[model samples]
Target: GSVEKLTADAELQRLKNEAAEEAELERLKSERHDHDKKEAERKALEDKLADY
Candidate 1:
C-alpha cells in the first residue's frame, strides 16, 4: 500500500512538471506566432500603402 501511494505521488509530480513545461512551450509558441502574423500583416499594409 505504501509503495503504491509513493508511486502515485511521484507520477503526479512528474505529470505536473510535464504540464507546466507544455504550457510554457505553448505560450512561447503562441507569442511567436502572433508576432510573425503581425509582422506579415504590417508588411502587407506597407506594400499596399506604397502602391497608393
Candidate 2:
C-alpha cells in the first residue's frame, strides 16, 4: 500500500510538470510568432521603400 501511494504521487507530480512545460512552450511560441510576423512585415516594407 505504501508503494502504491508513492507511485501515485510521483505520477501526479510528473503530470503537473508536463503541464507546466507545455504552458511554457505555448508562451514561447506565441511570443516568437507575434514578433516574427511584425519583423517580416517591417523588413518587407523597408526593403521595398529603400531602393536608393
Best by lDDT: 2
Per-residue accuracy of model 2 over 1-52 as CA lDDT, tens digit each = 6678887798778877886776886778866877678767758855776656
Model 1 global lDDT (CA atoms, 0 to 1): 0.73
Q: Per-model C-alpha lDDT, please?
A: 0.73, 0.74
Give one digit per residue, the lDDT tens place, for model 1 in 17-52.
Answer: 876776786778866776678767758855667656
**lDDT score at residue 30, model 2, on the 0-100 scale:** 68
Which residue pairs in candidate 2 have backbone atoms (N, alpha carbon, C) closer than 3 angstroms, thus clashing?
A: none
Off by over 4 Å in 2: 26-36, 45-52
**Model 1: colliding residue pairs:** none
